[PDB]
Amino acid sequence: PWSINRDDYELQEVIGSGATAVVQAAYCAPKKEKVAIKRINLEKCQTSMDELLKEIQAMSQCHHPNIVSYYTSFVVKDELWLVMKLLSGGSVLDIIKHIVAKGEHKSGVLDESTIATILREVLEGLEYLHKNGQIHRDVKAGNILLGEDGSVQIADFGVSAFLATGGDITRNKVGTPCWMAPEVMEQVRGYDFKADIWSFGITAIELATGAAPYHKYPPMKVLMLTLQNDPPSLETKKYGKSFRKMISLCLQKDPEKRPTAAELLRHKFF
Amino acid sequence: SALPWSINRDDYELQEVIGSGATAVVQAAYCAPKKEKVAIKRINLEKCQTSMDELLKEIQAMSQCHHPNIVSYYTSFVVKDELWLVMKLLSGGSVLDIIKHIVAKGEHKSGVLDESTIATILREVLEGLEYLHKNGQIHRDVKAGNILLGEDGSVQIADFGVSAFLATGGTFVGTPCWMAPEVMEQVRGYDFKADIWSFGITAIELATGAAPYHKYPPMKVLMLTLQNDPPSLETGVQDKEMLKKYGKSFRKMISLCLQKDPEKRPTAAELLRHKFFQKAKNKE
Amino acid sequence: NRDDYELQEVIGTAVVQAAYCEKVAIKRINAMSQCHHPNIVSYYTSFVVKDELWLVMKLLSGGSVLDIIKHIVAKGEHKSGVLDESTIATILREVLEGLEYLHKNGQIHRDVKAGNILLGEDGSVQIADFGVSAFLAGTPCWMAPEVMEQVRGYDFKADIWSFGITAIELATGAAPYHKYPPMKVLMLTLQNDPPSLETEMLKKYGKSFRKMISLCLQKDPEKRPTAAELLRHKFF
Amino acid sequence: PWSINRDDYELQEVIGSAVVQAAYCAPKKEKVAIKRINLEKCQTSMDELLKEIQAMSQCHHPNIVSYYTSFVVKDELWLVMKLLSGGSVLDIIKHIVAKGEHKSGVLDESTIATILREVLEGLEYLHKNGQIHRDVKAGNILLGEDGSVQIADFGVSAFLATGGDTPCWMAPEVMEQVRGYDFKADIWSFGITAIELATGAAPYHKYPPMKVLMLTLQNDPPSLETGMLKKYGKSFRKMISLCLQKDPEKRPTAAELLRHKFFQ
Ligand SMILES: Nc1ncnc2c1ncn2[C@@H]1O[C@H](COP(=O)(O)OP(=O)(O)NP(=O)(O)O)[C@@H](O)[C@H]1O
Ligand SMILES: Nc1ncnc2c1ncn2[C@@H]1O[C@H](COP(=O)(O)OP(=O)(O)NP(=O)(O)O)[C@@H](O)[C@H]1O
Ligand SMILES: Nc1ncnc2c1ncn2[C@@H]1O[C@H](COP(=O)(O)OP(=O)(O)NP(=O)(O)O)[C@@H](O)[C@H]1O
Ligand SMILES: Nc1ncnc2c1ncn2[C@@H]1O[C@H](COP(=O)(O)OP(=O)(O)NP(=O)(O)O)[C@@H](O)[C@H]1O
Ligand SMILES: [Au+]
Ligand SMILES: [Au+]
Ligand SMILES: [Au+]
Ligand SMILES: [Au+]
Ligand SMILES: [Au+]
Ligand SMILES: [Au+]
Ligand SMILES: [Au+]
Ligand SMILES: [Au+]
Ligand SMILES: [Au+]
Ligand SMILES: [Au+]
Ligand SMILES: [Au+]
Ligand SMILES: [Mg+2]
Ligand SMILES: [Mg+2]
Ligand SMILES: [Mg+2]
């Protein structure tokens, strides 16, 4: 019962403006609620509504306290508008960016108890998604949103994560495959939920160091450093405990070796 | 008097022009034999792409439908190339005059007319439409511009018949299994329930100052109304938060009227029993 | 110089305490500062104790302008605006004369806001001390704009912007983008029309006030007026 | 079950101020809330509090903050109870008032109905057991992490916040004082907290406490007494007026109130 009439939403301040998406605040009159709208130019992102069908459907079905509330979606001219809850506390990345700008980071960005609190809620959000056979695909500090009540939710499940990570290449998208290399098999099959576990590990480093391990390198070098070398760590301070052990479990090259969200939801760190 | 009302042109002395419209002109006139100052709507038959033959059924209804909440129609006759509709001159102006007055003052953004005032005006409109519908008639053009007020505070619906007919214009070819929805909708027609929708839009107009899609050209408003779910109070409005003043009883009254399926819409008699119309006060 | 100072109530980048000799405020810190003006909180003296730098300044028992705003906002009298246009004009003229003096001495306040507009028992208006914040102070044709920003830095015109935001604050009760995280306000400022009194029936404020605000809140600092040019504005 | 030994409780952060402090209970494994009460300061002893403590042990209801155990630590009485992480309803109110979004009202009418129904069901349980809460207010409505609504401070806390203490020609007030007040006192309190959720504060919040006592006895308050709030209508104001009758006999029971239009 969320309106798909464009004239029921009063567009207000633009929150974000990137190449793929603009995030704009809007007042929805029938629901008397100030909401967030992610506007996506379909032609610019080389995509279509038919291509995003099952993504939108998954967004319509996956609801959890630790996932940003999705309301509805509709087409306005050449854009798809995704209507969701506006979270007034901002992103965890915003907090990280504030600590660095203040110069309160050269001994660690977020406290270990602060990291444990945020990541547990993120992991419970992922646990729900994985239970429903879904993958988030774009876990990062920028996609962890905070409510003014202190709640922690993952943003960008569905369409947004889909367009940021190669499109329809997961398990949700031969012959005699006995001679196929493992990487060929993975392309036929599609990658699984364990991709989220790796991204979670990088996010853990991000909350502590203030950045992803290879942040300074161009995209192609980041990809080459990740594939040619052993998995990264905090070193690339006041952390050395189960936190590093927890990170090393996530950051394993073989996705099979990585733990599930539920198995990870244990561990002494949390 | 009397009488009755004269069909001779020389018996009427033209006076002040009230509205110089794009189709018709409303001019005050004095009727000598009746010793009464009346209102005459002058409709150029050529300009409105019409003749007397198609207007005869409308005039017939106009001469029969007489009710406290319907502007008193007196008579009609042809003067050269135009039809003169003689009616009672009302001194209070229209509800649109009130709206325009508040919109010009800049006191409209948080609402134009309060709920008590709206309830008072529209319940009288409902009594008028109830009368028309029971007589098997449809107004077809209910809007603030067609709600005239008397000096004493009486509320009367204007332009029933010819004017409403002309303002709104006024399964076949092809094979049904292949026909587009909009082709098939042509033979569906409409009844008195069409007035109930228009009444709901009029409710919004008294609150906001305008109809939902007033900012768009005529072809676009057709498109947007037919394409989208029914409009609500803040649909098409610039500053939507500022209309939070209007309560839920008014909003549920509106949503009763504004349903795509006319069979789901209440009758005028049903609407008169709604909670919102208890806010009606003395007539000014 | 020495104390000679009776440690009293806490008011109160560490703490600020009231002290007797006579009503005086001292600020504890974890050189000059020659500025002296009725519209600026300046230091009488500065001396050391034990890992702390004491800064003696005039005690203002009238609180801040934000205190007045917070009382109004806590009540229901911010329906048609917070502070009256006449009260805003009086308070901000004093602040602007304080900024004019600072800028003429090559100084920048760096933190103008209602919380830093302190009020005296006298009814005096002055901007809070800025000395401690002030302590943390080729051929560019081929430079990227993001490189240019660091090289160009900022000057006194930054105070003029903050002054404009403070004008909105006294009328509305808050800075335009108060509901968003601190590190988001840059993006919110740039990706939207220059902040205004509206960025809702809370406005009985005239065009002259809105005009004054718009002058201050121009993205390019060069287009912003000087404090002296602002003092000439019709609003004041 | 729950240990009466201090050693088994590890004191942590202070929640609020009697002082409320969080503590971890190692046997079993649960972070609990412990209220610490200085006996002499409130001019109270264990002897006068025993009847209050035994009632706390007996009461067991989803809408009542779960009381675990009590024990004396030196000159302090420790009340061990469930820790609720959602805070109080007063905290939510205070936040909305501070940012001035209490214009047109504080809590939504639907939100007030849901919260107060749970409170009223909590009160119904207490009254069924012949008990009186004595201190129903928004600050004593605590929220659970699972969205639960629970009444806090039954027994010792509400008792100490309120205090330890031929009729033919006798005045009605005097008769009331000899008999003592009953459960209908909670119903009035309930009506005051309903105004608190809608306006942000009690009806006489302006005037200083103690003067509000004199003002109450001289008048009779509605929602309008605090200070626009037109979104609250019909059955809500009627519900309040039923609670806020001067004659306690004319106030409805909690069970009668749960049948009111405002609470399907
Ligand atoms: N629901 C929301 N509520 C509040 N803020 C949001 C919400 N969704 C997104 N944002 C913010 O809007 C801005 C832009 O969002 P987004 O388009 O996801 O940029 P991003 O995080 O850089 N992702 P990407 O552009 O794909 O790299 C960011 O500051 C987000 O934190
Ligand atoms: N019987 C009447 N008594 C007094 N005023 C009238 C009467 N009939 C019409 N008017 C006024 O005459 C003016 C013009 O009337 P009309 O020709 O209906 O124009 P309109 O209402 O603007 N319709 P339109 O010109 O097609 O947009 C309006 O201001 C009416 O209020
Ligand atoms: N001269 C003064 N007279 C009276 N009060 C003062 C004076 N100077 C500072 N204060 C108050 O001292 C308190 C703390 O001051 P300060 O050390 O500047 O931190 P602050 O005002 O909170 N600034 P910030 O830490 O950046 O938010 C504030 O409430 C000031 O209003
Ligand atoms: N079991 C609990 N779990 C979580 N918080 C609690 C619990 N009990 C009390 N609190 C909080 O402790 C703080 C102070 O408690 P209290 O001493 O009861 O003050 P209060 O809220 O004014 N109640 P009262 O003093 O009885 O009127 C309040 O913010 C309560 O919300
Ligand atoms: Au794109
Ligand atoms: Au799903
Ligand atoms: Au094979
Ligand atoms: Au015509
Ligand atoms: Au008729
Ligand atoms: Au057919
Ligand atoms: Au200086
Ligand atoms: Au150059
Ligand atoms: Au106590
Ligand atoms: Au009991
Ligand atoms: Au007797
Ligand atoms: Mg994002
Ligand atoms: Mg008309
Ligand atoms: Mg309490």
Curated annotation (Swiss-Prot), chain C:
The active site is at D111. ATP binds at I11, G12, T13, A14, V15, V16, K27. It is found in: Cytoplasm. Residues 5-236 form the Protein kinase domain. Effector serine/threonine-protein kinase component of the WNK-SPAK/OSR1 kinase cascade, which is involved in various processes, such as ion transport, response to hypertonic stress and blood pressure. Specifically recognizes and binds proteins with a RFXV motif. Acts downstream of WNK kinases (WNK1, WNK2, WNK3 or WNK4): following activation by WNK kinases, catalyzes phosphorylation of ion cotransporters, such as SLC12A1/NKCC2, SLC12A2/NKCC1, SLC12A3/NCC, SLC12A5/KCC2 or SLC12A6/KCC3, regulating their activity. Belongs to the protein kinase superfamily. STE Ser/Thr protein kinase family. STE20 subfamily. This is Serine/threonine-protein kinase OSR1. It comes from Homo sapiens. The gene is OXSR1.
